[PDB]
């Protein structure tokens, strides 16, 4: 199954309001190399996602998890709603590295970010309307 | 920089990853589904081979959540610099229940522990402390 | 020099200490009284947060007397450099009887283990070790 | 270079050894015959004392074959730089059967783990993980 | 509190007001206000005082626990026997495996062991290390 | 200390080294080496480490050969060192490249001996056997 890394990077580059040239100065890839990556002519290796992840400001493993969502579902709900994922992932990272109840009970910051988003959607509660302490209390309930 | 090189032995192997730059080790993911029996053990294969940077060895260290929440300890854990086989994670399930590991679950982390490679020299001195 | 910074989160926190200058780690004291059940586990809170010196991580290592005499093992033990939460000591009581931990008892020690923080790089080359196919010489 | 010095305390002590120069640790051999009871423990004496090279401590780490095949974990394992007593290997036999360790069996390995000997300093401020709270 | 601790231990180890100053780095006025009680000593200074005096800082905290527990510190009142015996407990911990793999707290084991010599009236300079090592192994059952 | 002189003299000749070439590696004089090999001068434990590096053989294998001397009066491993050398190279490649050996091995010397006894039992020549076949026999001994 295809990895769809070309569409993922082009979508995330536009989400970060970066031109192909500005990303080119961070990654070190040429503007033509970046264009061929986004279009699909040149394949993107596991070491190129690492370079793209640092250039975009996103941990590279989230780009792998988005590519895995494409293979399993045909689409990526995280990529479709990345703004809500970005804001929600900031809360779990602050909670993971500052709260012992999360550090000693967490399993996967990506997986727990999705379920945390799903539980706000379960209550149909909008992100960005939520507080950090409000999400932390719910974070500790999912982790017993 | 220092580089930790790896190679996937199968399609099921996962790329080791950190969440932040200051993470102690790279998370190791299980390449298969398996069950760790109660008061038992299991060797989780990652389907990767590693080449460590100079001046260190590879310590398979436990993950905090899995150890505390599921009563699991990591045995062995010493990966020599010249080992190029499948990296296996030895897991001891001390709980009264079986634990089910899923493909992609982060079962441990690989820390590049700086060590000394010294020469051994036998002494006939009875060595005494200086306190 | 290298500095290990810590802050007490409550009055119950103890200052980590060594007996000698070259002791491997700073002794971590339990901030509360608790019982680790037989063939069971417990998360011992030190009620401190730490900032580790550069070029290392914090390994929660066992103490020889408590491990050997009381069948206690230290689980987890990896303290990332950017972790600022409550430092917890995961203890596995493998004995058939409960163990009574008292406030102030040294349950483990924190060692600043020098490590490398490298970048990961995937190769397609199959790696193989030199030794073998040749022998002594 | 850096030297790991040892002395045999009895006739039964074995010289710690590696198979190659780049092995992580020196193999520690049991100086006596003993039994590690089922779901029990044992303190295996090596009958050696060690002086470690500077800038490190001695970690008694498990060996892969014995741990996986016999359900054995190494407890304690911290050897301070100034310890000159008999080096003991704490072994936990988690199996439901007794394990027989015989004289000369390599029960663990001694790794000279590079560590920092830092100063301790108390702060009054609540320390914050300072990196990523404003998003990617 | 801690000011009284410092004055007794400084005099026991034969140090002047001046000799302390450049070991600590503290000025003599800061030290003088510390010892009588005008200026309180924060906990990062006791480690500096501990290295300047030659005593582990955690024993100074343990002496403070005797003050909180009894109103005075019997160990500080009888520090000469504690110092010399702590040399014996420290030597036994780092040289004998029966202590290294059974010790819990070098201070607590030094305190009780002194009480077993005081209970039976045996003098510190009158005891040898080899006999003290033997009594150490029974307390560590 | 119990036959170490014979070990060095036999292994030096096995590795096609002159007394001088070993002297130039170890740092020992040709006279010190000659008295070591004959039995006039006793060999300390720190000299075996020096001799091991000079010969290209791990010093711990020289200790294991000495244990056969103490146990039998002779060393069958030293008598057939050419086959041990070739078989020890196979176990080393398998130990560091296959997880089934790395996570089940106990002692590469003892396991090299067991493989040698199983080739002799089955009338198989070492110089004739392949590594891939040897790897399976190693995994059989390590259940
Ligand atoms: Ca363990």
Coordinates of N, CA, C and O in Angstrom, one line a residue, chain F residues 13-138:
Chain F
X13 N 53.5 -21.5 17.3 CA 53.8 -22.2 16.1 C 52.6 -22.4 15.2 O 52.7 -22.4 14.0
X14 N 51.4 -22.5 15.9 CA 50.1 -22.6 15.1 C 49.9 -21.4 14.3 O 49.4 -21.5 13.1
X15 N 50.2 -20.2 14.8 CA 50.0 -18.9 14.1 C 51.2 -18.5 13.3 O 51.3 -17.4 12.8
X16 N 52.2 -19.5 13.1 CA 53.3 -19.2 12.2 C 54.1 -18.0 12.6 O 54.5 -17.2 11.8
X17 N 54.4 -17.9 13.9 CA 55.1 -16.8 14.4 C 56.5 -17.2 14.9 O 56.6 -18.3 15.6
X18 N 57.5 -16.5 14.7 CA 58.8 -16.7 15.3 C 58.8 -16.3 16.7 O 58.0 -15.5 17.1
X19 N 59.8 -16.8 17.5 CA 60.0 -16.3 18.8 C 60.2 -14.8 18.8 O 59.8 -14.0 19.7
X20 N 60.9 -14.3 17.7 CA 61.2 -12.9 17.6 C 59.9 -12.0 17.3 O 59.7 -11.0 17.9
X21 N 59.1 -12.5 16.4 CA 57.9 -11.8 16.0 C 57.0 -11.7 17.2 O 56.4 -10.6 17.4
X22 N 56.8 -12.8 17.9 CA 56.0 -12.7 19.2 C 56.7 -11.8 20.2 O 56.1 -11.0 20.9
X23 N 58.1 -11.8 20.2 CA 58.8 -10.9 21.0 C 58.6 -9.4 20.7 O 58.5 -8.5 21.5
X24 N 58.4 -9.2 19.4 CA 58.2 -7.8 18.9 C 56.8 -7.3 19.1 O 56.6 -6.1 19.2
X25 N 55.8 -8.2 19.2 CA 54.5 -7.9 19.6 C 54.3 -7.7 21.1 O 53.8 -6.7 21.6
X26 N 54.7 -8.8 21.8 CA 54.5 -8.8 23.3 C 55.3 -7.7 24.0 O 54.8 -7.1 24.9
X27 N 56.5 -7.4 23.5 CA 57.5 -6.7 24.3 C 58.4 -7.5 25.1 O 59.3 -7.0 25.7
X28 N 58.1 -8.8 25.2 CA 59.0 -9.7 26.0 C 60.2 -10.0 25.1 O 60.2 -10.0 23.9
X29 N 61.3 -10.2 25.8 CA 62.6 -10.6 25.2 C 62.5 -12.0 24.7 O 61.7 -12.8 25.2
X30 N 63.3 -12.3 23.7 CA 63.3 -13.7 23.2 C 63.8 -14.7 24.2 O 63.3 -15.9 24.2
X31 N 64.6 -14.3 25.2 CA 65.0 -15.1 26.3 C 63.9 -15.4 27.3 O 63.7 -16.5 27.8
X32 N 63.1 -14.3 27.6 CA 62.0 -14.5 28.5 C 60.9 -15.4 27.9 O 60.4 -16.3 28.6
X33 N 60.7 -15.2 26.6 CA 59.7 -16.1 25.9 C 60.2 -17.5 25.9 O 59.4 -18.5 26.1
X34 N 61.5 -17.7 25.6 CA 62.1 -19.1 25.6 C 62.0 -19.8 26.9 O 61.6 -21.0 27.0
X35 N 62.2 -19.1 28.0 CA 62.1 -19.7 29.3 C 60.6 -19.9 29.7 O 60.3 -20.8 30.4
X36 N 59.7 -19.1 29.1 CA 58.3 -19.3 29.4 C 57.8 -20.5 28.7 O 57.1 -21.4 29.3
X37 N 58.2 -20.8 27.4 CA 57.7 -21.9 26.7 C 58.3 -23.2 27.2 O 57.6 -24.3 27.1
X38 N 59.5 -23.2 27.8 CA 60.1 -24.4 28.2 C 59.7 -24.8 29.6 O 59.6 -26.0 29.9
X39 N 59.4 -23.8 30.5 CA 59.0 -24.1 31.8 C 59.8 -23.6 32.9 O 59.5 -23.8 34.1
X40 N 60.9 -22.9 32.6 CA 61.8 -22.3 33.6 C 61.1 -21.1 34.3 O 61.2 -21.0 35.5
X41 N 60.5 -20.3 33.5 CA 59.8 -19.1 34.1 C 58.3 -19.3 34.1 O 57.7 -19.7 33.1
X42 N 57.7 -19.0 35.3 CA 56.3 -19.1 35.4 C 55.6 -17.9 34.7 O 56.1 -16.8 34.7
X43 N 54.4 -18.1 34.2 CA 53.6 -17.1 33.5 C 52.5 -16.6 34.3 O 51.6 -17.3 34.7
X44 N 52.6 -15.3 34.7 CA 51.5 -14.7 35.5 C 50.3 -14.4 34.6 O 50.3 -14.5 33.4
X45 N 49.2 -14.1 35.3 CA 47.9 -13.9 34.6 C 47.9 -12.7 33.7 O 47.2 -12.6 32.7
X46 N 48.8 -11.7 34.1 CA 48.9 -10.5 33.2 C 49.8 -10.8 32.0 O 49.7 -10.0 31.0
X47 N 50.6 -11.8 32.0 CA 51.3 -12.2 30.8 C 50.4 -12.9 29.7 O 50.7 -12.7 28.5
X48 N 49.4 -13.6 30.2 CA 48.5 -14.3 29.2 C 47.8 -13.3 28.4 O 47.5 -13.4 27.2
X49 N 47.4 -12.1 29.1 CA 46.8 -11.1 28.3 C 47.7 -10.5 27.3 O 47.3 -10.2 26.2
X50 N 49.0 -10.4 27.6 CA 50.0 -9.9 26.7 C 50.2 -10.9 25.6 O 50.3 -10.6 24.4
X51 N 50.3 -12.2 26.0 CA 50.5 -13.2 25.0 C 49.3 -13.4 24.1 O 49.4 -13.6 22.9
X52 N 48.1 -13.2 24.7 CA 46.9 -13.3 23.9 C 46.8 -12.3 22.8 O 46.4 -12.6 21.6
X53 N 47.2 -11.0 23.1 CA 47.2 -10.0 22.1 C 48.3 -10.2 21.0 O 48.1 -10.0 19.8
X54 N 49.4 -10.8 21.5 CA 50.5 -11.0 20.5 C 50.2 -12.2 19.6 O 50.6 -12.2 18.4
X55 N 49.4 -13.2 20.0 CA 49.0 -14.3 19.2 C 47.8 -14.0 18.3 O 47.6 -14.7 17.3
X56 N 46.9 -13.1 18.7 CA 45.7 -12.9 18.1 C 44.6 -13.8 18.5 O 43.6 -14.0 17.8
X57 N 44.7 -14.3 19.8 CA 43.7 -15.2 20.3 C 43.2 -14.5 21.7 O 44.0 -14.0 22.4
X58 N 41.9 -14.6 21.9 CA 41.4 -14.1 23.2 C 42.1 -14.8 24.4 O 42.2 -16.0 24.4
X59 N 42.5 -14.0 25.4 CA 43.2 -14.6 26.5 C 42.4 -15.7 27.2 O 43.0 -16.6 27.8
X60 N 41.1 -15.5 27.3 CA 40.3 -16.4 28.0 C 40.2 -17.8 27.4 O 40.0 -18.8 28.1
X61 N 40.5 -17.9 26.1 CA 40.6 -19.2 25.5 C 41.9 -19.9 26.0 O 41.9 -21.2 26.1
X62 N 42.9 -19.2 26.2 CA 44.1 -19.8 26.8 C 43.9 -20.3 28.2 O 44.5 -21.3 28.6
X63 N 43.0 -19.6 29.0 CA 42.7 -20.1 30.3 C 41.9 -21.4 30.2 O 42.1 -22.3 31.0
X64 N 41.0 -21.5 29.2 CA 40.1 -22.7 29.1 C 41.0 -23.9 28.7 O 40.7 -25.0 29.1
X65 N 42.0 -23.6 27.8 CA 42.9 -24.7 27.5 C 43.7 -25.2 28.7 O 43.9 -26.4 28.9
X66 N 44.1 -24.2 29.6 CA 44.8 -24.6 30.8 C 43.9 -25.4 31.7 O 44.4 -26.3 32.4
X67 N 42.6 -25.2 31.7 CA 41.7 -25.9 32.5 C 41.6 -27.4 32.0 O 41.4 -28.3 32.9
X68 N 41.7 -27.6 30.7 CA 41.8 -29.0 30.2 C 43.0 -29.7 30.7 O 43.0 -30.9 30.9
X69 N 44.1 -28.9 30.7 CA 45.4 -29.5 31.3 C 45.2 -29.9 32.7 O 45.7 -30.9 33.1
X70 N 44.6 -29.0 33.5 CA 44.4 -29.3 34.9 C 43.4 -30.5 35.1 O 43.6 -31.3 36.1
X71 N 42.5 -30.7 34.2 CA 41.5 -31.7 34.3 C 41.9 -33.1 33.7 O 41.5 -34.1 34.3
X72 N 42.7 -33.1 32.7 CA 43.0 -34.3 32.0 C 44.5 -34.6 31.9 O 44.9 -35.7 31.5
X73 N 45.4 -33.6 32.2 CA 46.8 -33.7 31.9 C 47.2 -33.3 30.5 O 48.4 -33.2 30.2
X74 N 46.2 -33.2 29.6 CA 46.4 -32.8 28.3 C 45.2 -31.9 27.8 O 44.2 -31.9 28.5
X75 N 45.4 -31.3 26.7 CA 44.3 -30.5 26.2 C 43.8 -31.0 24.8 O 44.5 -30.8 23.8
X76 N 42.7 -31.6 24.7 CA 42.2 -32.0 23.4 C 41.8 -30.8 22.5 O 42.0 -30.9 21.3
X77 N 41.4 -29.7 23.1 CA 41.2 -28.5 22.3 C 42.4 -28.0 21.6 O 42.5 -27.6 20.5
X78 N 43.5 -27.9 22.4 CA 44.8 -27.5 21.9 C 45.4 -28.5 20.9 O 46.0 -28.1 19.9
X79 N 45.1 -29.8 21.0 CA 45.5 -30.8 20.1 C 44.9 -30.6 18.7 O 45.5 -30.9 17.7
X80 N 43.6 -30.2 18.7 CA 42.9 -29.9 17.4 C 42.5 -28.4 17.3 O 41.4 -28.1 17.2
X81 N 43.5 -27.5 17.4 CA 43.2 -26.1 17.5 C 42.8 -25.6 16.1 O 42.0 -24.6 16.0
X82 N 43.3 -26.2 15.0 CA 42.9 -25.7 13.7 C 41.4 -25.9 13.5 O 40.8 -25.0 12.9
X83 N 40.9 -27.0 13.9 CA 39.4 -27.1 13.8 C 38.7 -26.2 14.8 O 37.6 -25.7 14.5
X84 N 39.2 -26.0 16.0 CA 38.6 -25.1 16.9 C 38.7 -23.6 16.4 O 37.7 -22.9 16.5
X85 N 39.8 -23.2 15.8 CA 39.9 -21.9 15.2 C 38.8 -21.7 14.1 O 38.1 -20.7 14.1
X86 N 38.7 -22.7 13.2 CA 37.7 -22.5 12.2 C 36.3 -22.6 12.7 O 35.4 -21.8 12.2
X87 N 36.0 -23.4 13.7 CA 34.7 -23.5 14.2 C 34.3 -22.3 15.2 O 33.2 -21.9 15.2
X88 N 35.3 -21.8 15.9 CA 35.1 -20.6 16.7 C 34.8 -19.4 15.8 O 34.0 -18.5 16.3
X89 N 35.3 -19.3 14.6 CA 34.9 -18.2 13.7 C 33.4 -18.3 13.3 O 32.8 -17.3 13.1
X90 N 32.9 -19.6 13.2 CA 31.5 -19.7 12.8 C 30.6 -19.3 13.9 O 29.6 -18.7 13.7
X91 N 30.9 -19.7 15.2 CA 30.0 -19.4 16.3 C 30.1 -17.9 16.6 O 29.1 -17.3 17.0
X92 N 31.2 -17.2 16.3 CA 31.3 -15.8 16.5 C 30.4 -15.1 15.5 O 29.7 -14.1 15.8
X93 N 30.4 -15.5 14.2 CA 29.6 -14.9 13.2 C 28.1 -15.1 13.5 O 27.3 -14.2 13.4
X94 N 27.8 -16.3 14.0 CA 26.4 -16.6 14.3 C 25.9 -15.9 15.6 O 24.8 -15.5 15.7
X95 N 26.8 -15.7 16.6 CA 26.4 -15.1 17.8 C 26.1 -13.6 17.6 O 25.1 -13.1 18.2
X96 N 26.9 -12.9 16.8 CA 26.7 -11.5 16.6 C 25.8 -11.2 15.4 O 25.6 -10.0 15.1
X97 N 25.2 -12.2 14.7 CA 24.4 -11.9 13.5 C 23.0 -12.6 13.6 O 22.1 -12.2 12.8
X98 N 22.8 -13.5 14.5 CA 21.5 -14.2 14.6 C 21.0 -14.1 16.0 O 21.7 -14.4 16.9
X99 N 19.7 -13.6 16.1 CA 19.1 -13.5 17.4 C 18.9 -14.8 18.1 O 18.9 -14.8 19.3
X100 N 18.7 -15.9 17.4 CA 18.4 -17.1 18.0 C 19.7 -17.6 18.8 O 19.5 -18.4 19.7
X101 N 20.8 -17.2 18.4 CA 22.1 -17.5 19.1 C 22.4 -16.5 20.2 O 22.8 -16.8 21.3
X102 N 22.2 -15.2 19.8 CA 22.6 -14.1 20.7 C 21.7 -14.2 22.0 O 22.3 -13.9 23.1
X103 N 20.5 -14.6 21.9 CA 19.6 -14.6 23.1 C 19.5 -16.0 23.7 O 18.6 -16.2 24.6
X104 N 20.3 -16.9 23.3 CA 20.3 -18.3 23.9 C 21.7 -18.8 24.2 O 21.8 -19.9 24.8
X105 N 22.8 -18.1 23.8 CA 24.1 -18.6 24.1 C 24.5 -18.4 25.5 O 24.0 -17.6 26.2
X106 N 25.4 -19.3 26.0 CA 26.0 -19.2 27.3 C 27.5 -19.0 27.3 O 28.0 -18.2 28.1
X107 N 28.2 -19.8 26.5 CA 29.6 -19.6 26.4 C 30.1 -20.1 25.0 O 29.8 -21.2 24.6
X108 N 30.7 -19.2 24.2 CA 31.1 -19.5 22.9 C 32.1 -20.6 22.8 O 32.2 -21.3 21.8
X109 N 33.0 -20.7 23.9 CA 34.0 -21.7 23.9 C 33.3 -23.1 24.0 O 33.6 -24.0 23.3
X110 N 32.4 -23.2 25.0 CA 31.8 -24.5 25.3 C 30.9 -24.9 24.1 O 30.9 -26.1 23.7
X111 N 30.2 -23.9 23.5 CA 29.4 -24.2 22.3 C 30.2 -24.5 21.1 O 29.7 -25.3 20.2
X112 N 31.4 -24.0 21.0 CA 32.3 -24.4 19.9 C 32.7 -25.8 20.1 O 32.8 -26.6 19.1
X113 N 32.9 -26.3 21.3 CA 33.3 -27.6 21.6 C 32.2 -28.6 21.2 O 32.4 -29.6 20.6
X114 N 31.0 -28.3 21.7 CA 29.8 -29.1 21.4 C 29.6 -29.3 19.9 O 29.3 -30.4 19.5
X115 N 29.7 -28.2 19.1 CA 29.6 -28.4 17.7 C 30.7 -29.2 17.1 O 30.5 -30.0 16.2
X116 N 31.9 -29.1 17.6 CA 33.0 -30.0 17.2 C 32.7 -31.5 17.5 O 33.0 -32.3 16.6
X117 N 32.2 -31.7 18.6 CA 31.9 -33.1 19.0 C 30.7 -33.7 18.1 O 30.7 -34.9 17.8
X118 N 29.8 -32.8 17.7 CA 28.7 -33.3 16.8 C 29.1 -33.5 15.4 O 28.5 -34.3 14.7
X119 N 30.1 -32.7 14.9 CA 30.6 -33.0 13.6 C 31.5 -34.3 13.6 O 31.4 -35.0 12.6
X120 N 32.2 -34.6 14.7 CA 33.0 -35.8 14.8 C 32.0 -37.0 14.9 O 32.3 -38.1 14.4
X121 N 30.9 -36.8 15.7 CA 30.0 -37.9 15.8 C 29.3 -38.2 14.5 O 29.1 -39.4 14.2
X122 N 29.0 -37.2 13.7 CA 28.4 -37.4 12.4 C 29.3 -37.6 11.2 O 28.9 -37.7 10.1
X123 N 30.6 -37.7 11.5 CA 31.7 -37.8 10.5 C 31.5 -36.7 9.4 O 31.3 -36.9 8.3
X124 N 31.6 -35.5 9.9 CA 31.6 -34.3 9.1 C 32.9 -33.5 9.3 O 33.3 -33.3 10.4
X125 N 33.5 -33.1 8.2 CA 34.7 -32.3 8.3 C 34.4 -30.9 8.5 O 33.5 -30.3 7.8
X126 N 35.2 -30.2 9.4 CA 35.0 -28.8 9.7 C 35.3 -28.0 8.4 O 34.4 -27.3 7.9
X127 N 36.5 -28.0 7.9 CA 36.9 -27.4 6.7 C 35.9 -27.6 5.5 O 35.9 -26.8 4.6
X128 N 35.1 -28.6 5.6 CA 34.1 -28.9 4.6 C 32.7 -28.4 4.8 O 31.9 -28.4 3.9
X129 N 32.4 -28.0 6.0 CA 31.0 -27.7 6.3 C 30.7 -26.3 6.0 O 31.6 -25.4 6.0
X130 N 29.4 -25.9 5.7 CA 29.1 -24.6 5.4 C 28.6 -23.9 6.6 O 28.2 -24.5 7.6
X131 N 28.6 -22.5 6.5 CA 28.2 -21.7 7.7 C 26.7 -21.8 7.9 O 26.2 -21.9 9.0
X132 N 25.9 -21.8 6.8 CA 24.4 -21.8 6.9 C 24.0 -23.2 7.5 O 23.0 -23.2 8.3
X133 N 24.7 -24.3 7.2 CA 24.4 -25.5 7.8 C 24.8 -25.5 9.3 O 24.2 -26.1 10.2
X134 N 26.0 -24.9 9.6 CA 26.5 -24.9 10.9 C 25.6 -24.0 11.8 O 25.4 -24.4 13.0
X135 N 25.0 -23.0 11.2 CA 24.1 -22.2 12.0 C 22.9 -23.0 12.5 O 22.4 -22.8 13.6
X136 N 22.3 -23.9 11.7 CA 21.2 -24.7 12.1 C 21.7 -25.6 13.2 O 20.9 -25.8 14.2
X137 N 22.9 -26.2 13.2 CA 23.3 -27.1 14.2 C 23.6 -26.3 15.5 O 23.3 -26.9 16.6
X138 N 24.0 -25.1 15.4 CA 24.1 -24.2 16.6 C 22.8 -24.0 17.2 O 22.7 -24.0 18.5

